[PDB]
């Protein structure tokens, strides 16, 4: 199917406690593969997935070079933002950045990204055309004019259509056995009376990859959208994901309920019934 690469970065200023903390992480699909932490002893980009260890130290030298450069830029961006918003040096502020690309199943470029948030809200983002910028406020308009005049977009487009796509295809091949794997959900049901006349049916999906999944409860084929308690999909910590969905039913009308599980790793959707 399609695939994606994303580098995430956060800078958090800490006025009295020295210079801003910088943390970057890289992902292929739902799999982390690199990290860099400015407060870490190493001062290097480190591997976090088996398939990236085989890169030679020139990759690593260049990657920690690029990521160290990024932390300095974002440190200066935090200061420029203090001016633009006329904020005091007393406060802690956050600058986040994401960039990366999507490719189709043939490995062709679909989409590029390059965007920033300041204090948790959109600042400036490159549009899907990879030529224009979306400025979220007056402060960002200034940056936009600055980057428009400097033709920043063209450089990013070159990175995103070129280097970023090649990297993705490479990682997807080198790490074919884990990245192009599909682990279907291991499913089961639990069941607990909550009174003389009602019971909870809970439908579980465990050990699946990638994270995308849909759990749905029906009563006699009717979707129970508004009456389904659902948790956010969560990492099990071994690279796979978990989710459950529950409904409150009258006892013993349990047989009227069906839980439906859809996931890319299943030949056909599963139906579970107590």
């Amino acid at each position: 199917g399609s695939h994606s690469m994303r580098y995430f970065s956060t800078s958090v200023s800490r006025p009295g406690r020295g210079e801003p903390r910088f943390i970057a992480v890289g992902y292929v699909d739902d799999t982390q593969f690199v990290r860099f932490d400015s407060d870490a002893a190493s001062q290097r980009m480190e591997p976090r997935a088996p398939w990236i260890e085989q890169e030679g130290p020139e990759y690593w030298d260049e990657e920690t070079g690029k990521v160290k450069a990024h932390s300095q830029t974002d440190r200066e961006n935090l200061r420029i933002a203090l001016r633009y918003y006329n904020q005091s040096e007393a406060g802690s502020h956050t600058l986040q950045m994401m960039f990366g690309c999507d490719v189709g199943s043939d490995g062709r470029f679909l989409r590029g990204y390059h965007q920033y948030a300041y204090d948790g809200k959109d600042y400036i983002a490159l549009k899907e055309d990879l030529r224009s910028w979306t400025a979220a406020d007056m402060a960002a308009q200034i940056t936009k004019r600055k980057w428009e005049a400097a033709h920043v977009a063209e450089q990013q487009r070159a990175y995103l259509e070129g280097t970023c796509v090649d990297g993705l295809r490479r990682y997807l091949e080198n790490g074919k056995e884990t990245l192009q794997r599909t682990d279907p959900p291991k499913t089961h049901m639990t069941h607990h009376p909550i009174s003389d006349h009602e019971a909870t049916l809970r439908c579980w999906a465990l050990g699946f990859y990638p994270a995308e999944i849909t759990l749905t409860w029906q009563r006699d084929g009717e979707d129970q959208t508004q009456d389904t308690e659902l948790v956010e999909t969560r990492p099990a910590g071994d690279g796979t994901f978990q989710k459950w969905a529950a409904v409150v039913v009258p006892s013993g009308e349990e047989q009227r309920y069906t839980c439906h599980v859809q996931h890319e790793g299943l030949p056909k959707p599963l139906t579970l019934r107590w």
């Binding site: 690029k66 830029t73 200066e76 420029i80 600055k146 980057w147 920043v152």
Partner: peptide
């Protein structure tokens, strides 16, 4: 593979 101010 990894990748002017405000």
């Amino acid at each position: 593979l990894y990748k002017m101010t405000f």
